Ligand binder design. Structure first.
Ligand SMILES: [Cl-]
Ligand SMILES: [Cl-]
Ligand SMILES: [Cl-]
Ligand SMILES: [Cl-]
Ligand SMILES: [Cl-]
Ligand SMILES: [Cl-]
Ligand SMILES: [Cl-]
Ligand SMILES: [Cl-]
Lengths: 219, 219, 219, 219, 219, 219, 219, 219
């Protein structure tokens, strides 16, 4: 378990992170974390490591792109003095290119995305114990579907950044890809983005595996 | 994994099982399974065993005792033709004795509890592939608190029926007891009964472990 | 114009047809026809052929398959004594196979679909002046996506019944396909099924063209 | 098609334009345009010219007279940097004279109306590719009904302005007049102002005809 | 005053009579009589003839034609044992011809109107002390508007039945006509049917004058 | 009729005047005047004198005492530039003495009441055509009931003020007293203050009689 | 204390008893007893006699007269097998005579009141351990107010039945009368019937004193 | 009775005091005091000492610790110029230690609690006639339950402070302890903190006993 006792773990992202969490503070055991993967992570950490006393904060905001993260980073991240920051962003940065292909101010292209995400990591790294970069995802098994193909480009950038900055790394697309060998996307999310409890569990598990969570502790 | 491909798993119980499930069907949407351990179970099974093709049904009803289960058993269990039935009942059977001590017809005392639950297990066993008996629980660490002491006795009844009937058995009290070495009850549930996400994860993990779930499959 | 003065045109289908229509009557206010292609059809007919005096009824019901149509056919179609019946069914028959793959009784497979739809068309044809058969559709441009591939097969069934029965025929998939040369699905419908105003205009225009509507009447 | 690819088309007016559109921005494919003729225009343009990539904004505000348009013109029009502006105003400027004939500060008389509308056109013309002036209307077939007779005076002024400024021109009253040869007003709008889907389609079609929309493109 | 001490006066009609009255009783609170002319009548009678001890019942139902009255006559009129029955019906009988011209079964044409209303008056007259027949009305000053022209014909029917049957008679159209020498319809009712407080006062005053009310009693 | 054409009549008072009127402006034919005596007055004036073109504004505010009137007089009265002001105040000034007999900052005693009301009249008189002073009231027939006895003292002061300032005068208590010879208070208002439609008609009539309203005009 | 351990005490009445109690059971939660004197009684008994183990049921129904009690007596009283029945009825029996003087079938005059209440007491007495008869009341200090005078007569009937039948007896009017030496009615209840917390405490204290409650137990 | 006529009694605390009281003023006989022990105290004082004319204000705020009281003391207490101040605080100061044992900024430890509470008393004492210190409580009969054991430490501090400052003193824990000899906590409050009407009556009675309330006055 990478996260130590008494430490503060902060999640940021878009609606997949937000999941109806309490605004502004996003902190507490009884609904304030929202109802998706963040909450599941905390639940599992408390069920299996209750003695760790890990404080968890949810700063997800529905609709955000990486440009929106940068715009609130000082207030929502820096000022919170976290020990661990988990970032999952990119879905909207890409989706807007496909659902509003002519409202282009809504799009964040890849080279802007890469530099902005890097800028967030590099600002934050000297202030925290660790950073966890979660790729965006798209629940779609055809690599050549245009949005899936774009999303994968953004996920490759995330991986690159994590390597180069010594951040932890969660490939959420690889986790979905496995389940997509069996299930058609609609069984997980009609819109291919916002999933079921199952999708959130896929994400929660992917995150917990990367931080060295044990389902039954050996120690 | 005790549960196998193509099987229908039906959960029944009180509010801990219900958690806002869709009535009457308790199946078949996103959200139809409720927002507690039953949903978490189905999500983790889907995340880790997507190919198993399990159908899951949530017949939990808030407020039920085992007397209420008996009254709807035919329509809600037997008529559903499940392959597997999971029962978690007893919390209200006990809690009414303590919160409404003078309304005795709302109590289900130990003789009624054992005979009824026994009868339901005996009746159902030959019609299904398997039964899972979950103990009720009380989120309270002091064995001599009166309601914890009573709830532990009711759990002994469940354990003994499961043994007699070669049912699977989940000791939910023991799962909470482990966490209660560290956390005061209120950290998990103000009222010592209806817990947080963490509590429902304690439950879901206790269920899954009993049915041979692996967090990361070795094969 | 195939539809003539004084005729009653009854539309039946699933949510794509329903679009919040008034239940049970589906006629006779402002708003009773719902807010999608059925209403747009009635509006354009009124704008361009005000003198035609068409009565229009919307018997769409959200969630329906052709099995559901059959169960209400007598009350909702035959008892209404329509002159013209428009049917657009199949989306849910197919989508349940993909979004709830393990709940097989909710699926309407191709044998049940063809026999039922056929039976309804055969039964209705001698009681009415005319039938319009609209294909189901899936807003997805890749023919080998599994649900698009299945939906195209169901459309072939509709086309063949319409041919056998000398019904009018609207290929809604082809209409979407044309736009999908330019737009990614999400621009029209996140879930690839329930579209925007633009999608409903694609539908209404496909219907109208089949019934000989002219945007500006040449006579 | 007068409108070219990538261009921005902005509609302004009163409730007939507003139709519940999103405030303040009035822009987007999924409800932000409101539910009347603006939305229908955009829907048809996307269904038939999807590749044009026309951005559309709805700045209608219920209750407005031309005096209200002038009061918000800088923020709602100029600042938006549209390529094409469509104006439909006058209904309220006239209605108030008839429904609140003694709260006269609510009235905009014809010579004030004419000069204010001219002032809007002349300010805007050097900043855009084109302007479309839609007459107000009143759904009433008797030319001598007092409100209809007044409304027609205002429509004549609009036509004059469009001629003199080389603006495009939509005679909405002429479009209703045709349908009113068959339908009594109440079949379109009980209040003779705010119509049904049919009325909105009459308006949408009138607008699309003036911009050179083709229902089936020859090219 | 035609109405006398201790008598029960029952009003029946459509929405103009209903005005949100309490269903089913239409009597007996504060507010049970609705918020239009029926309530105003009861208030003025109470203000000026408090000692009369009149019981008043409002059996108006929004949307009703005389065909609807007939279907509930036994339960809503005869079973109430009124001493006086006031009927104001015809607006919807006529308006459906104009707002839904093609839904002919919703129309109540003049032959059905005269026969039904006649039958109800003949049947009720020997069971009660008196009947008041109020004409329907249309708030429209042009006699040749088609719906006003039709409504005036229906009023002639009412006047003739009242004459034949020695019923009291209230010409509501004439009352509106007087005000319409000064006000355009919209000042009283946008839709020419459901008026303001002023319109309901026009009605209440027309009723009261017919029953010999004095604003200031001379005795 | 004391009120001439084109003139502005403003009512101020407490909840008996307010009756849910539109805040802040309190002006319009379709609900803005609220649902009690103000609205009835306007309704009758329009039904019988439609050609007068009297503008009416309702500045009633529930809970007000005369001290509250003074606090808003500049904004709510002076600034409105009325031609006629009607004041009805005192109910709360007195009620508070009886319902909150120990929260005394809520009480306005008689000599404060008298001087404040005088101050309002004397400020306003040089700015308007006329002032109408309506007494407060209490719907209670026993002159010696403590609140009734107090209320009458306040009504005597109002009368004195009106005499001394040449204001018009409405004795609302005398109007209720007449009806109270027959009806027990509860038949008009359970709380003896806020009446039924009948009470509002008693008030409306009292006001209209003082301004020279004719129910059937001789001229 | 007249009530003893293990006994079921059932309260019945009108709104004063109901106070929002849970329907139909009126027992068994927190809140099921309503928010007035019945709840206060149960609370004080629990605070001071926790060991008594009393079951309490609230069968009050807003609006009831003794005629309504009779119609539900079998289901709501006798079928509950109470040991003690407390009845407080008469307020509406009387108040309808005054607030709806002309709707005579809603009145329960003294002959009907005495015979019915008598019959219910006689019928119930041999089936239960004891009966408590509470007078109705009117919060009004003037004995010659007409409704107070009538209510006092109805109270005399209750007192006489209680005497005849050796029922316990609570004179609620006398309890209010004592406070009314100091407070005007409006301080306790604007409408002289439905009081504040203070009024319900007056009631609860009057009940408790009659059943031998001690505020501080001497033993 | 320690409280004299005309005096102002102000209660402050957490949710147990607040009970939904009116914000900000917390003053009035008809709901403004909230629905728990404060309201019951006032009710009893009015029922038994109506002539005292005691003004009562409720400044409870749900969630408060003693640190929160200090933060609002000037506005909510000092500025109100009370004659008597009742303080009940500590529940949250302690609860947070047990329900959010790792969000420690939410905890107020005992020595901070003691000094802050002292600081409140010492500031206030020279400004008022008297102060009443009510201990916090926890509805839990086992002295060794961790939260109960902590709560008792805080109650001992309260008692010490009251002794040292000559404040009145209410041991709310001792009052619950008596009832807990018979009832399990859940019969009074599932969460062991927020009780039933019974709990509020236990508190109300404890407070009234300390101020010398007599249930039947000797004088
Ligand atoms: Cl999002
Ligand atoms: Cl439960
Ligand atoms: Cl559907
Ligand atoms: Cl408008
Ligand atoms: Cl109607
Ligand atoms: Cl008021
Ligand atoms: Cl009642
Ligand atoms: Cl609290």
């Amino acid at each position: 378990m990478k996260i130590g006792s008494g430490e503060k773990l902060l999640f940021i992202g878009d609606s997949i992170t937000d999941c109806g969490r309490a605004r502004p503070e996003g902190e507490g055991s009884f609904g304030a974390l929202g109802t998706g993967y963040v909450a599941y992570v905390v639940g599992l950490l408390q069920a299996v490591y209750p003695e760790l006393g890990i404080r968890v904060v949810n700063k997800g905001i529905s609709g955000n792109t990486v440009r929106d993260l940068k715009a609130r980073w000082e207030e929502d991240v820096i000022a919170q003095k976290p020990d661990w920051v988990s970032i999952m962003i990119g879905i909207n940065d890409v989706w807007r290119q496909y659902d509003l292909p002519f409202m282009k101010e809504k799009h964040v292209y890849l080279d802007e995305y890469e530099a902005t995400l890097r800028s967030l990591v590099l600002e934050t790294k000297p202030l925290v114990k660790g950073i966890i970069l979660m790729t965006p995802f798209y629940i779609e098994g055809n690599e050549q579907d245009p949005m899936r193909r774009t999303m994968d480009q953004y996920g490759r950038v995330v991986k690159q950044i994590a390597e180069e900055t010594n951040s932890l790394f969660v490939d959420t697309q690889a986790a979905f890809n496995e389940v997509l060998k069996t299930l058609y996307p609609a069984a997980l999310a009609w819109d291919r983005v916002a999933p079921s409890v199952a999708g959130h569990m896929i994400l929660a598990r992917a995150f917990l595996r990367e931080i060295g969570f044990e389902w039954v502790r050996s120690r």
